[PDB]
Design a protein around this ligand. Structure first.
Ligand SMILES: *[C@@H]1O[C@H](CO)[C@@H](O[C@@H]2O[C@H](CO)[C@@H](O)[C@H](O)[C@H]2NC(C)=O)[C@H](O)[C@H]1NC(C)=O
Ligand SMILES: *[C@@H]1O[C@H](CO)[C@@H](O[C@@H]2O[C@H](CO)[C@@H](O)[C@H](O)[C@H]2NC(C)=O)[C@H](O)[C@H]1NC(C)=O
Lengths: 45, 28
């Protein structure tokens, strides 16, 4: 292909259907699993 | 600028930061 430059995209664009008497309620759900890695020690010199 | 000293620009402009803040405000 090639090499290009450009201006980053922060993210999509969501438009919430807000009104003064409307609510959204979930009817289902999922269980999700994520990881987090943290360093605790270093080498003793 | 000085004798070998330079200041680098930030990656995010302050317009882009304003767009993160307005998204947090509109979501909330
Ligand atoms: C909740 O209802 C609203 C309409 O009252 C839905 O929002 C619209 O969705 C259509 C596409 O299906 C868009 O073309 C319209 O522009 C939307 N309106 C607004 C004001 O954003 C919405 O999809 C419904 N939400 C759910 C979860 O079904
Ligand atoms: C809630 O969502 C789950 C999926 O996330 C639905 O379970 C799936 O149902 C389909 C259709 O029977 C199956 O093909 C999949 O194997 C199911 N997925 C799993 C992980 O079991 C579930 O039926 C939904 N609940 C309701 C009430 O609609």
């Amino acid at each position: 292909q090639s090499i290009i430059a450009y201006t980053m995209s922060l993210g999509a664009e969501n438009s919430v259907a807000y009104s003064n008497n409307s609510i959204a309620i979930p009817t289902n759900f999922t269980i999700s699993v994520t990881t987090e890695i943290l360093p605790v020690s270093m080498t003793k010199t | 600028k000085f004798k070998g000293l330079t200041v680098l620009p930030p990656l995010l402009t302050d317009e882009m930061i304003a767009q993160y803040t307005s998204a947090l405000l509109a979501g909330t």
